[PDB]
Amino acid sequence: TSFTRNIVGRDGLCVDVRNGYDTDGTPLQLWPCGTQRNQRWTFDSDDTIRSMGKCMTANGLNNGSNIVIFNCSTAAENAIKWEVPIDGSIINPSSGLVMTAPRAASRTILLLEDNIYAASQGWTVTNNVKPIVASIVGYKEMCLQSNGENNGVWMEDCEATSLQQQWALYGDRTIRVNSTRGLCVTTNGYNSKDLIIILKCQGLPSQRWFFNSDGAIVNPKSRLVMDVRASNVSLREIIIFPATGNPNQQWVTQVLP
Ligand SMILES: *[C@@H]1O[C@H](CO)[C@@H](O[C@@H]2O[C@H](CO)[C@@H](O)[C@H](O)[C@H]2NC(C)=O)[C@H](O[C@@H]2O[C@@H](C)[C@@H](O)[C@@H](O)[C@@H]2O)[C@H]1NC(C)=O
Ligand SMILES: *[C@@H]1O[C@H](CO)[C@@H](O[C@@H]2O[C@H](CO)[C@@H](O)[C@H](O)[C@H]2NC(C)=O)[C@H](O[C@@H]2O[C@@H](C)[C@@H](O)[C@@H](O)[C@@H]2O)[C@H]1NC(C)=O
Ligand SMILES: *[C@@H]1O[C@H](CO)[C@@H](O[C@@H]2O[C@H](CO)[C@@H](O)[C@H](O)[C@H]2NC(C)=O)[C@H](O)[C@H]1NC(C)=O
Ligand SMILES: *[C@@H]1O[C@H](CO)[C@@H](O)[C@H](O)[C@H]1NC(C)=O
């Protein structure tokens, strides 16, 4: 009924009990990923998430409350239950608040905050603590390609050698330029027809993505999906647009060697 994984989030760092202490009340933080026991989280059918035999616990259920480790039997029941939405949030059901890394740096302390679907609120429960590196193949079997910081992404004929067709799929639900991992696929607004470009990763809702079961790449805040504009590759414009199920919005990842 239980299984154990790392939890990877902002900038590819992991959820870590600060300094390996199991004392009740010790904050959770970001720290570079590893196998140490204070980064190994056991998910149970009672919706608890445990490390070193203690529970991930909201120290209060307010916006900005700290998340800590605490004895499972003595903590408040409402403070120790968590769900894991398919879009990569980690949510406390009682409060509706979500796990958030307010800064990218190692040693950032994790907080419960209002859900704004930010990349700083995206997490991946996994034993692979390295980003997955893949092509993203879409309309007409062409590949998504980055064309540098501040420019639009667009489709091109796939080629195994193009580094600008290689994407690092990070645990915080960002899609990064593999050769330049400080750069993020970013929608330039939350409205239909806004352009998708590459920008410096900043933890924003504009930089968070979800690969859903219909082949779409969804931006949770806008609700809108990746779309090759007007089904016209020659425009060299990828936008966000409502999900239509059409070929111009279908994508798959293909892992690279
Ligand atoms: C919940 O906590 C959040 C983090 O402190 C608040 O958002 C932050 O508000 C600050 C300004 O007072 C500022 O640091 C940031 O704009 C913002 N941070 C992020 C990433 O959201 C949030 O405050 C609300 O939302 C912000 C955007 C402002 O518009 C405030 O006026 C809002 O109150 C907190 N929510 C509540 C209910 O206070
Ligand atoms: C969580 O807090 C519990 C209540 O304070 C701890 O249980 C107590 O542990 C004592 C030995 O450490 C034991 O003599 C007490 O009778 C017991 N109280 C109860 C109600 O069980 C608990 O410690 C764990 O559970 C006990 C039963 C022993 O197996 C300990 O070795 C366990 O650590 C605390 N949990 C943790 C993980 O610290
Ligand atoms: C994606 O980028 C990564 C990170 O720069 C590349 O991985 C490095 O590859 C070199 C040579 O094989 C290794 O010595 C390093 O250890 C790697 N670094 C890390 C942090 O993993 C990788 O080659 C790129 N391309 C692919 C397809 O993954
Ligand atoms: C596609 O986009 C290109 C570039 O603007 C344009 O020349 C062409 O007419 C567009 N329409 C179609 C149907 O290809």
From Swiss-Prot:
- Which spans of this chain does UniProt mark as 1-beta repeats? 52-92
Glycan-modified residues? 63, 71, 178, 232
Which residue ranges contain the repeat 1-alpha?
11-51
- Disulfide bonds, paired cysteine numbers: 14-33, 55-72, 143-158, 184-201
1-gamma repeats at which positions? Answer: 95-127
Repeat (2-beta) residue spans along the chain: 181-219
Q: Where are the 2-gamma repeats?
A: 222-249
This protein's source sits in the domain of life called Eukaryota
2-alpha repeats sit at 140-177
Boundaries of every Ricin B-type lectin domain copy = 1-126, 129-254
Name this polypeptide is given: Nigrin b B chain
Q: Which organism is it from?
A: Sambucus nigra
